Amino acid sequence: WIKGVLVRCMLNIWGVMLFIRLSWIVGQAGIGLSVLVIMMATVVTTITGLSTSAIATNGFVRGGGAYYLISRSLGPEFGGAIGLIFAFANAVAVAMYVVGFAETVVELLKEHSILMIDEINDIRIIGAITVVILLGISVAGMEWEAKAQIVLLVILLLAIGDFVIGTFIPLESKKPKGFFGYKSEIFNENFGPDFREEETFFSVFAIFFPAATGILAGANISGDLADPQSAIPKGTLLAILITTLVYVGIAVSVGSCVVRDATGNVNDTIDFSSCESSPCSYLMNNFQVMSMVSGFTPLISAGIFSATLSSALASLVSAPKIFQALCKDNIYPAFQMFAKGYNNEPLRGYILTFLIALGFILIAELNVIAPIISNFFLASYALINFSVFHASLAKWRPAFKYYNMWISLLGAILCCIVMFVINWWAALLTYVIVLGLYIYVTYKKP
Amino acid sequence: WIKGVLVRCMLNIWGVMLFIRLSWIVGQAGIGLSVLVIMMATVVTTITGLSTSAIATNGFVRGGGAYYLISRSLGPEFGGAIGLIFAFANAVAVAMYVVGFAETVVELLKEHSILMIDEINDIRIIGAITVVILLGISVAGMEWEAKAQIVLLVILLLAIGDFVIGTFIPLESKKPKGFFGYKSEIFNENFGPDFREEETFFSVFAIFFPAATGILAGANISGDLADPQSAIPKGTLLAILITTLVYVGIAVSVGSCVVRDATGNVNDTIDFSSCESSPCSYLMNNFQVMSMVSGFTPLISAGIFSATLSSALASLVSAPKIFQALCKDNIYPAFQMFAKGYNNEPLRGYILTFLIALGFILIAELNVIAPIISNFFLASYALINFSVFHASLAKWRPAFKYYNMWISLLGAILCCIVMFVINWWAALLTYVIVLGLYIYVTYKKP
Ligand SMILES: CCCCCCCCCCCCCCCC(=O)O
Ligand SMILES: CCCCCCCCCCCCCCCC(=O)O
Ligand SMILES: CCCCCCCCCCCCCCCC(=O)O
Ligand SMILES: CCCCCCCCCCCCCCCC(=O)O
């Protein structure tokens, strides 16, 4: 059924980079290039969506999810490499979605005069106490996670709704903080880039790319939904069409409404803003110096609480339940510890992904963590888009998930050169890893 | 016989970067790091020497040379990729060794007041008229090229000999040009780096690496020498031991003898030089601004004429005679034109390597051309050092060319990460090329 695969994907790709960093990305690269970031990051994942819909099309592989169907259709050589890369990418994405949860709690406790230890040392405290109570949800409560998640999405569509219903209001006491209407003087200004002290185009692309990346969570269940052949193809390619048309409609709206670099004080007019207020260049309540812009009705603070905890919970249950099936096929013999669990729940893999999330959570900057999430998600999407081409050349019958051609090769080049433009010495290292884990698997005795 | 395989290798690796750029390299990176450049560039080619000696060890493949023995021992999948990479690297190295021939002719015609067109536009003229009279040697005269080359090497060992016999002389009228004896004040100064406006360690490594790279020219004949199994292993690994102990003995001698940044005029003493002369920082006859240092007896100008023409002639006869056998196995069907010739001489491949040399010769800077020679020579040595490991894992019997272990893998990593530190977007492109030319060959019907 589509309504249990579209929700689990559309709720996973609406994450942390929608409210608290998309204004920063449309502030750095303007409007005309940020929409190009949306379109390039949605081409590079709609080719992967076509490919992972063509994977789930061929056979009646009902058991397992997102590892049982990409391994038994494409061979253990690619299936053992993707089963480590994607299971590590979900182990670090949970650290990303929790530092994004913590830095909007400490910046809400900065209001009303609350300081725990320091400015960014309390991010480590809240990120410590968040993951240990996400393990309490991941271990025990599974009936309350799959059920009652539409209530965890309708309070996110209300957060989109009051945001759009608030940016048409006047709010005359809010224009010192940069808020305005829809004037042409502010759209014509925000159309070009004003790149900051170090950020370039591919830098803000690396920051943005984890906002369009959880599309395999729809296909990450197949022993749970009925008729998995029909559902996966249209509930993955339709969540992308909703989410990209929400990202463009938010980036163009918040770009044509709030002016960059404007502080909040008493000022008057009587040639950049050309409006009733005037500011200085060499700000705190601006559009490029604070990360949380809000029209009105502050349940956007609740709209974070359902956009970052839900996508972190869906990437904490999903890394050891892939890594367990990887260690059950016994492809890598050094990892054979991580298959014994307590209802087939791996509790000794939860400790491993807890240590990985706790290691990558102690660095308390989201703009440092997001490129090394966008590294491994491209290093798994390139392996999917290339392994389907390699099965198309070393003849697996695709059975038409609306496009299963050899244009996926073009989606495996764009996941490769863009992964090297962003931090080339970390793409070299992961391609040496995924070539060594290919040669080790193809030349072993089994 | 060793005396016809050691000469053809030792004369090919003594090339352009010995007299006219090794002083610049020991001037940039000092003495203590330039010897590390020698040692790293000789480790990364002695692993390749062990590997290409283990290739020539297995069978009695008497016909052909350096393509017949690396293809029929390692398979057409690696043999068709190395047969293009190495045959293009020799097609651009002939442009390198002729711009190095031309810029020491125009800097000798700058003395005695001769200007043809401009300062570096006459390099293009002399490089144009040099390659067209190297094609006259390559096509017609082959008996005078193989015979009478010891006379083309003894006038190079005389150029080393009078250089060493000249740097012990006083030459009191030459010390304004920076020449001195062997003082401790000049050795202690030249021990550390004084990197220029853009050059780093791997930049001067990229400049130096074509000085230690023609070691496959010994194994590039096997239908010409008797008993090729015995000779190749010890005439390749012994030319490297001579040439590295000449490079170190030249770099430490010219580094401890001539001071950097000293102009030639009338000066006197009465704390950098601490000698009888004194100069200013903000030079023409110095050690880092002129490329040709000379002790005495100017037949070093003849010592260029046998070090750069001989190594360019040996890389003009060797690119189409590899590419012809590649186009005779008909692995790549689009290249099937380049096999018909006039005594089996390919004349329509000479036109192709003439156009490649003429294309890369019109850029008249040696420091631009040398990194894109050191790119493709590392991209062929990595494929040799990895294809021997891949035949060691996909079981070809090595028969002990004194080391044929799986340490060659370590020589295929060091040819890979150092090829990416130098100009990463040109190593990415050539690894996509050599992976596409692997997948095209392994999945074709034959
Ligand atoms: C940097 C350029 C791409 C790097 C490639 C990383 C590792 C990919 C592994 C795929 C190799 C498989 C090729 C076909 C092998 C076969 O035919 O058996
Ligand atoms: C042209 C390619 C050069 C780059 C080399 C990439 C890294 C190769 C690593 C391969 C490791 C193979 C390990 C095999 C272990 C075993 O067989 O037990
Ligand atoms: C950038 C990292 C290394 C890139 C390697 C480029 C391609 C050279 C090796 C080709 C793949 C060889 C794998 C052999 C596996 C098999 O066929 O069994
Ligand atoms: C790990 C993925 C990296 C992607 C790198 C892919 C490099 C390009 C491969 C091109 C293969 C072309 C095969 C041609 C097939 C044919 O024409 O028969």
Residue numbers in the entry:
A (entry chain A), B (entry chain B): 287 to 556, 573 to 584, 586 to 645, 648 to 700, 704 to 754
Please give the exact wording used by the authors of the publication that reports this structure.
Cation-chloride cotransporters (CCC) are central to the regulation of intracellular Cl− concentration and have key physiological roles in neuronal excitability, trans-epithelial salt and water movement, and regulation of cell volume. The CCCs are strictly electroneutral transporters, NKCCs transporting two Cl− ions coupled to the movement of one Na+ and one K+, whereas NCC and KCC couple the movement of one Cl− ion and either Na+ or K+ respectively. All CCCs are feedback-regulated by the concentration of intracellular Cl−—this is mediated by the WNK (kinase with no lysine)-SPAK/OSR1 (SPS1-related proline/alanine-rich kinase/oxidative stress-responsive kinase 1) signaling pathway. Here, using single-particle cryo-electron microscopy (cryo-EM), we report the structures of human NKCC1 (hNKCC1a) and mouse KCC2 (mKCC2a) at 3.5 and 3.8 Å resolution, respectively.
The final model of hNKCC1 was primarily focused on the transmembrane and extracellular regions from the high-resolution map, although we were also able to determine the overall structure of hNKCC1 including the dimeric C termini from a medium resolution map. We have strong evidence that both of our structures represent inactive states. In the case of hNKCC1, we analyzed phosphorylation of the N terminus using a phospho-specific antibody—as shown in Supplementary Fig. 6a, there is no detectable phosphorylation of the protein as prepared for cryo-EM, and from extensive previous reports, we, therefore, know that this protein must be inactive. Like in DrNKCC140 and hKCC139, we note densities within the cleft at the dimer interface and we attribute these to four lipid molecules with lipid tails in the hydrophobic cavity contributed by TM residues, and hydrophilic heads facing intracellularly. In our inward-open structure of hNKCC1, extracellular access to the pore is blocked by the side chain carbonyl of E389 from TM3 interacting with the side chain amino group of R307 of TM1b and by L671 from TM10 —the narrowest open radius of this potential “gate” is ~1 Å. To test the importance of these residues we examined the transport activity of hNKCC1 mutants. Mutation of any of these residues resulted in Cl− transport activity that is <20% of wild-type activity, with changes in R307 and E389 being particularly impactful; on the other hand, mutagenesis of neighboring E670 has little effect on function. At the intracellular end of the inward-open pore, it is noteworthy that R358 from ICL1 interacts with D632 from adjacent TM8. The most populated Na+ binding site is defined by backbone carbonyls including L297, W300 in TM1, A610 in TM8, and hydroxyl oxygen atoms of S613 and S614 in TM8 —this site (S1) accounts for 40.6% of TM domain Na+ binding sites in the simulation data.
